[PDB]
Amino acid sequence: MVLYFIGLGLYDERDITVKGLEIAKKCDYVFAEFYTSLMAGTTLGRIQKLIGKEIRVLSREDVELNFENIVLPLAKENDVAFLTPGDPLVATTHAELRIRAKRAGVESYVIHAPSIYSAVGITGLHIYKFGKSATVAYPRGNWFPTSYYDVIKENAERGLHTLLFLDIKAEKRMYMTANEAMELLLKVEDMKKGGVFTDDTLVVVLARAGSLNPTIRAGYVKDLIREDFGDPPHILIVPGKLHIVEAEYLVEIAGAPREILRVNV
C-alpha cells in the first residue's frame, strides 16, 4: 500500500541518507532508475549489497510509459521503494509519478537526499544568487540547440549565477565534460555574438560533487578550456558579478586567479 521515492544522493552508495537506507531495507520490493542521472562513484552491485535487496533497474520507457503496471501493482499490497540518483523529484518528470500513485490508490512518501542543485554551495557561490538553471545538450545532426546560452545571458545581466547541467547518455554511460561544454558555448557565442561567453568569461567547474575529493576549479575560459578536471560527472557554472566573499573563496579554495578579485567583483 506504500511507495517510497528515495534519493541516492550525489556520487556513491553512502550518499543515501540513513532514513532512506533503513526504509529501503524494510521494503518488499526495490526498483531504481539511472536515466535521469548516474552514480559515478559506485555500482548497482555495491548499492544492492548496502541495501541487502535485489534491485530492479527501470528504463526511461519503463517509468514514463509503464510505471503504473510495473511498480504500482506491487505497491498496492507491499512496501515498495523507487530509488533515484540525487534528490527525488528534482528531475522534472518524477513529480507526476506521485499523481499516478494517487490515481492507483497508493500512498507515496518522499525521502530526500543531497542534490547537485544544493551541493553547488561547495563552490563558495551564494546559493540565493543562482538564477534559472539549464542543460548543455550535444548538437545532433542538423539540430543545434542553444537555449542554455540565453539562460546564461538573462541570469548574468541580472547579476545571477547559472548552473549548467551537462549532457549525458545514461544507458551508454558517457558524460559531457566541462571542456566540451566550454567549446560548445564558445561556438554558440560566435554564432549569436551576445558577448555572453568568451575566452575572458569566468567559469567554475565542479567535478564529482559528493566525493571526499571533488575537483573545484575557477578561472577564465581561455585557461580552463583544455584543463583536466578528472573523471565525471562534471558541472559547469557561469557566475554573475561576485560578492567579494565569493571571489575570495574561489581564490583560496578553487585556485582562481587573483585577477577575479578586481575584474569580477
Ligand X SMILES: Nc1ncnc2c1ncn2[C@@H]1O[C@H](CSCC[C@H](N)C(=O)O)[C@@H](O)[C@H]1O
- Residue 233, preceding bond cis, omega within 30 degrees? yes
Q: With binding defined as CB under 6 A, does residue 123 bind ligand X?
A: no
CA gap 174, 170 in Å, rounded: 7
| x/- map, 159-178, ligand X, by CB under 6 A | ------xx-x----------
> To 5 degrees, how large is the angle CA 113–CA 116–CA 119?
85
State the minimum distance, in angstroms, from the CB of residue 110 to a copy of itself: 5
CA gap 253, 250 in Å, rounded: 5
Q: With binding defined as CB under 8 A, does residue 84 bind a copy of itself?
A: no
Q: With binding defined as CB under 8 A, does residue 253 bind a copy of itself?
A: yes
Q: Strand 168-169 to strand 79-84: parallel, antiparallel, or no bridges (unpaired)?
A: unpaired
Which of ligand X, a copy of itself, none sits in contact with 225, Cβ below 5 to 8 A by type? none
Q: With binding defined as CB under 6 A, does residue 213 bind ligand X?
A: no
- Report whether 12 contacts 211 (CB < 8 A): yes
State the minimum distance, in angstroms, from the CB of residue 96 to a copy of itself: 6
| x/- map, 111-140, a copy of itself, by CB under 8 A | xxxxx-xxx-xx-x-xxxxxxxxxx-----
Q: Is the Cα dihedral 14, 15, 19, 21 positive or negative?
A: negative
Among 115, 201, 215, 264, binds ligand X (CB under 6 A): 115
Binding site as annotated, residues for S-adenosyl-L-methionine = 10, 87, 90, 115-116, 166, 209, 234
